[PDB]
Amino acid sequence: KPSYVKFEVPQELAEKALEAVEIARDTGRIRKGTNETTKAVERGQAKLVIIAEDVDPEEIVAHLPPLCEEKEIPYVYVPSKKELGAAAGLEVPAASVAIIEPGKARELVEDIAMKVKELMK
């Protein structure tokens, strides 16, 4: 199990995150890909970052947690890239995704944020 993972999110959170991504894709705005996500975080337009654990090499996404913790944006983990990409609307898999302009997911993101904070602390 890798080392860019700081804590253990359960089925609860992981599945809610996949569904929030699917809903935000079909209603709001979704930035797909590590680089799009990174730029969103650098400029501040990112309201939630979903990251994958099935990644190798770790040097791809090992910069995101210590950056989102600074910019104060929440981030969750999920165990596969194929599922995340299928949710985002791709046939290839995604390692990271950013949710912008949520629609019909707002309360899901509320709860995800609160539980992420409770878990980190």
Binding site: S3, T34, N35, T38, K39, E42, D56, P57, E58, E59, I60, A62, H63
Partner: protein
């Protein structure tokens, strides 16, 4: 983004999260064969700068070589004393290039493009080498790497036209000091290096 951060992580790995990663990775690499093909580069910024795309026809190969220099074999006939040494010799090619050549042996239908450093130990060094299939149509349909299907680019790594070979031949110095390295070494009787 995502590329400068990788560059930063790797510019000094003892200081970043890369040192212990490399410890474990080597624990596992030492059991692998000397030439092993892989799915994805370890230093993607560096690969993509050296020329690497995610198309069909590109192959990535890790190579393990031993460190240090040469030990000459002993001489049967009589020598003068200036010619008896056996131990403290070093090669005139670099280990990067030697690794490239081993990979080129193992994959004969291919051609080398470049290579990059990926780890050290006390006994071994590790290089990741990029290779290209010059008979793939996806590769003959791209003007950046369609030159490589030519009739004068086979044996590239062996004659010395890769970057490591040019470095070891002296084609990074241009004026005073480099009077004896162009247009070639044989042209001047090995008198450069």
């Amino acid at each position: 983004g995502m590329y400068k951060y990788i560059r930063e992580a790797w510019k000094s790995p003892k200081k970043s999260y890369v040192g212990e990663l490399l410890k474990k990775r080597m624990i596992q690499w030492r059991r692998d064969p000397v030439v092993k093909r892989i799915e994805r580069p370890t230093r993607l910024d560096r690969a993509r700068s050296l020329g690497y795309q995610a198309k069909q026809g590109y192959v990535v190969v890790r190579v393990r070589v031993r460190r240090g220099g040469r030990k000459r074999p002993r001489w049967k006939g009589g020598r003068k004393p200036s010619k008896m040494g056996m131990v403290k010799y070093s090669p005139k090619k670099s280990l990067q290039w030697i690794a490239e050549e081993k990979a080129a042996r193992k994959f004969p239908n291919l051609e080398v493009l470049n290579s990059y450093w990926v780890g050290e130990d006390g006994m071994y060094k590790w290089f990741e080498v990029i290779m290209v299939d010059p008979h793939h149509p996806v590769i003959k349909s791209d003007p950046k790497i369609a030159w490589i299907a030519g009739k004068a680019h086979k044996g590239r790594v062996f004659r010395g036209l890769t970057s490591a070979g040019k470095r070891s031949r002296g084609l990074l110095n241009k004026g005073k000091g480099a009077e004896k390295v162009r247009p070639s070494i044989r042209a001047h009787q090995g008198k450069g290096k």
